[PDB]
Amino acid sequence: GVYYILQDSPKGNQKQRSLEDFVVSLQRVSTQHEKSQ
Amino acid sequence: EATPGGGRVVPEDMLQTDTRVGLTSEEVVQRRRKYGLNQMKEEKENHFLKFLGFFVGPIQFVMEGAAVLAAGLEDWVDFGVICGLLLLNAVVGFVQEFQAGSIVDELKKTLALKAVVLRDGTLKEIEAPEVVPGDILQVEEGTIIPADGRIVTDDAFLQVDQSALTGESLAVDKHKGDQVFASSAVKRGEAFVVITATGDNTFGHFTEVLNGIGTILLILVIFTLLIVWVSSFYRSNPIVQILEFTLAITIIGVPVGLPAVVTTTMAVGAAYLAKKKAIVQKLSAIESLAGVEILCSDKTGTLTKNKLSLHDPYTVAGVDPEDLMLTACLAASRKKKGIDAIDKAFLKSLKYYPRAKSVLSKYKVLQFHPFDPVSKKVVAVVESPQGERITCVKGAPLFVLKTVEEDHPIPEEVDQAYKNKVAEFATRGFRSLGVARKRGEGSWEILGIMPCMDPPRHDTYKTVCEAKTLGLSIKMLTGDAVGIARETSRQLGLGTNIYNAERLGLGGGGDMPGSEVYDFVEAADGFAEVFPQHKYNVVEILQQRGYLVAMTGDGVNDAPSLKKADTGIAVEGSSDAARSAADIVFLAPGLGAIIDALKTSRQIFHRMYAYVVYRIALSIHLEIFLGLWIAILNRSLNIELVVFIAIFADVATLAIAYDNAPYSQTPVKWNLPKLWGMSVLLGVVLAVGTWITVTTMYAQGENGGIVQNFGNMDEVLFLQISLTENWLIFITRANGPFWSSIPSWQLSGAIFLVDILATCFTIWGWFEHSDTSIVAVVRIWIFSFGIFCIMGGVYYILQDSPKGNQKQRSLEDFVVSLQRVSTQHEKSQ
Amino acid sequence: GIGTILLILVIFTLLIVWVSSFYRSNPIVQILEFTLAITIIGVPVGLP
Amino acid sequence: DPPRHDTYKTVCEAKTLGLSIKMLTGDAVGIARETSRQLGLGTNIYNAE
Ligand SMILES: Nc1ncnc2c1ncn2[C@@H]1O[C@H](COP(=O)(O)OP(=O)(O)O)[C@@H](O)[C@H]1O
Ligand SMILES: Nc1ncnc2c1ncn2[C@@H]1O[C@H](COP(=O)(O)OP(=O)(O)O)[C@@H](O)[C@H]1O
Ligand SMILES: [K+]
Ligand SMILES: [Mg+2]
């Protein structure tokens, strides 16, 4: 009975969404600069 | 002292009585004041005032008072053992200092700034100090000026790199007859120097941690002594017994030779590193290298070889069918003793039939602008048999077009093909070089690109792979364009986030918000088209985020970056100034040597940290055992036994500097709060074990507790303390569980011998009045092993994106913005 | 990791047993019997 | 007008004393910035007006 009793959308806060946005943005700007106008 | 201190015409103008090339007969010079005047030779090899120096001090005075207050030389039991301990500490300290001073000088010898003077023949070079004053000198493009003095009559300007002894960091361009300052570099130039004031008017971090640790240990010993003296005053103990107690606690508490053995560990590690072809400038660079998190290394010479492969020059151009080879080789310095890596490949690949023999004849050079890093472009003006002034230009493929944009300005037919071909050779991992020629006064044809290629070193890929497991993050620095750098990153598995340095904001920004230029620099796999100033800016930015940066320097251009970096690494083939400004000088090429030195430095730091934790843990252990036992019960260990406990802690420690210590998988640093927490907990565990041992004999009598048949409290405590204290080193010198790495035979033997001696002490009891049973020592060994296991388990259990909040990003943005507005206003509309 | 933590638990139990036997001055044979029983029960021989 | 021969080291030691020296020049920004570079005073010079 003890074993049975204890047996039991944007997935991000500001930090997580900011981190993913930064990752994708740095990828894009790296590509953009690498194009070298 | 200028005129009356060894300077006048006969060491000044009698120098310039011969030609430029020639020097003979250092005659009777009467004074060789050359070897770092009265610094290393000061009181040469005293070798006997260091020995007595270790016999005088605060603790040594306490031991002398102890040895005197033992009724003088009445009996050689207390006096003998106390003087033996004092002599052992003095001898160990002397030997350790001798070893540490006899091996840091061997690294200084292999790194001295050798000085070149040219005589009648091709004299090789002169070892640094033993050069006569008032003698010629040849300072050549990044050499530390060996001797102070003035320039020779020949006309040329050398830009001396200053702010090492003066203020301004800009070009200090002394031209003729000015005061050339010793121990200073030359950014560029070719001049000769006359020596004046050959030795006159020449105008780490683990040590501080050790000093703080020693101060806190002194505080702890004073607190224990205060407890002992107070508790003896309440019991009205005679002064002699109080003095015995305070002597025992002084012996156990203050570590006599902690900084000495730490410096010995550093010196042995530095010697081992120099064996691995990595010479360390200052002994503190070991810890700095162990702590680095980001290694910003130049691609050329470190991540790739300096020999280039040439693949089918792109001779698809206008009227010019094959002039690429001829005009490119026209811009060769052809010294073959100071030429760079680029120059060699042109000559080695001159297997051209039509004119390669006739192209190197009569093309007399008039002007030869050297390769300027800010321009990435070498420009030469030479003569031709036709009489024209062929001004060859060679550099980055885009920069040559930027040069030729004036005449024949950017035709769409050729410019598009040129850009497409340079992009294609970037995709093929080829370094490209463009050449433009000047026949007349109004002709500028574009010749084409030269697809050179320098493959990465055969050990570079796996070295970079393993460097990611070591916690490092390698940031490549290329003067190449972004495409070549990105293809090299793909080849090396270095990740492809390469940003042009000028565009990103290193220096004059491109209105990029300051909070995000720092973020881009921090999370960047490389930096293409980098100038010398961008290196310093990258180092400055990366340290703001809280990193320890190791820079790969080579040449005089990156000297300020090497100084600013936490660990400036002078790579193979560096100039004298680069290695003088660096922290570690390497005599082997490639990133493999750097990573091996990193691992070795981490091992050395692990040895140091393990010993420090050992020493302060057993100090806390034995002080909070003996002081508490004196306070509670007015009893303490026999003075001979406690002296031998101290001795055994100086025998199992002269071997820690020589063992197979593992290296951390992450950059290692002094976490002083965690160090103190771990050591206090280990000492408390040891003290609890010892208190259990003694309270067993209180509970069940002197020969009935932890002892089975017979014994005595003092020798049993001696054995237990010795075993549990010396075995503590096996758990501090490990990554996680103590059974991970096998200790070296030296440490294991030195500790097992001490354990055997302690066991013999207990069995025969030859410093107290009774012996101990052979089964009692077995039980003590079992209990000590249990304490060792629980202590090791405690040690093992407790062993283990924008990097900013609003405040940090705002601060970085404000810094960059104020820099930009200062520049903007300084422009003054 | 689980085996390491189980070893730590067995060592803690053995330390309790040895300390409590020392305070009672048990003969070494009885202490060895106790430690053998707890070694047998504590460490799982064939978990992995 | 060259800086005094003791000025550079005085400014260097003034940073260890906790001070932060702010120069005030009636000169233009360029001359002030070059003087700051000479003296090791740091180059963030703003026109007052
Ligand atoms: N001696 C040279 N003559 C002409 N172009 C050169 C020379 N050395 C380098 N370059 C070109 O300048 C760019 C990079 O030079 P650099 O900044 O020297 O690369 P590294 O800094 O990695 O040595 C590349 O386009 C390279 O081909
Ligand atoms: N007596 C003067 N006659 C002409 N111009 C002057 C005179 N004194 C200063 N100046 C100029 O005025 C500007 C700064 O003057 P000032 O405000 O006097 O500098 P400081 O305040 O540092 O003495 C500089 O351009 C300087 O050359
Ligand atoms: K440094
Ligand atoms: Mg380079």
Author numbering:
A (entry chain A): 873 to 880, 892 to 920
B (entry chain F): 66 to 268, 284 to 880, 892 to 920
C (entry chain A): 292 to 339
D (entry chain E): 534 to 582
From the reporting publication:
The plasma membrane of fungal and plant cells contains a proton-pumping P-type adenosine triphosphatase (ATPase) that maintains the intracellular pH and generates a proton-motive force, driving the import of nutrients by secondary transporters. Unlike any other known P-type ATPase, Pma1 is a hexamer that localizes to specific ordered microdomains in the fungal plasma membrane. Autoinhibited Pma1 hexamers in the plasma membrane of starving fungi are activated by glucose signaling and subsequent phosphorylation of the autoinhibitory domain. We have determined the structure of hexameric Pma1 from Neurospora crassa by electron cryo-microscopy at 3.3-Å resolution, elucidating the molecular basis for hexamer formation and autoinhibition and providing a basis for structure-based drug development.
We collected single-particle cryo-EM data of the hexameric form of Pma1 from Neurospora crassa plasma membrane in its autoinhibited state and obtained a hexamer map at 3.28-Å resolution. The Pma1 hexamer forms a ring with sixfold symmetry, with a maximum outer diameter of 167 Å and an inner cavity measuring 24 to 55 Å in diameter in the cytosolic and transmembrane regions, respectively. Monomer contacts are mediated by both the cytosolic domains and the transmembrane domains. Specifically, there are two connections between the cytosolic domains: a loose contact between the conserved Thr-Gly-Glu-Ser (TGES) loop in the A domain (residues 231 to 235) and two α-helix termini in the P domain (Tyr541, Arg570, and Gln571). The interactions in the transmembrane region involve residues in M3 of one monomer, and M7 and M10 of the adjacent monomer, augmented by two polar contacts from Ser316 and Asn317 in L3-L4 to Gln780 (M7) and Arg859 (M10). The R domains are closely sandwiched between adjacent P domains, forming an extensive interaction network. R domains of adjacent monomers interact directly: Ser892 and Pro893 interact with Leu902 of the adjacent R helix, thereby linking all R domains within the hexamer. Opposite this dip, on the inside of the ring, the cytosolic membrane surface bulges upward toward the P domain, probably attracted by the partial positive charge at the N-terminal end of M3 and by Lys749 in the L6-L7 loop. Both the “dip” and the “bulge” are also evident from the cryo-EM map of the micelle surrounding the Pma1 hexamer particles [likely consisting of a mixture of β-dodecyl-maltopyranoside (DDM) with residual membrane lipids]. We find no structural basis for cooperativity between the monomers in the hexamer, but the structure implies that autoinhibition is enhanced by—if not dependent on—a hexamer context.
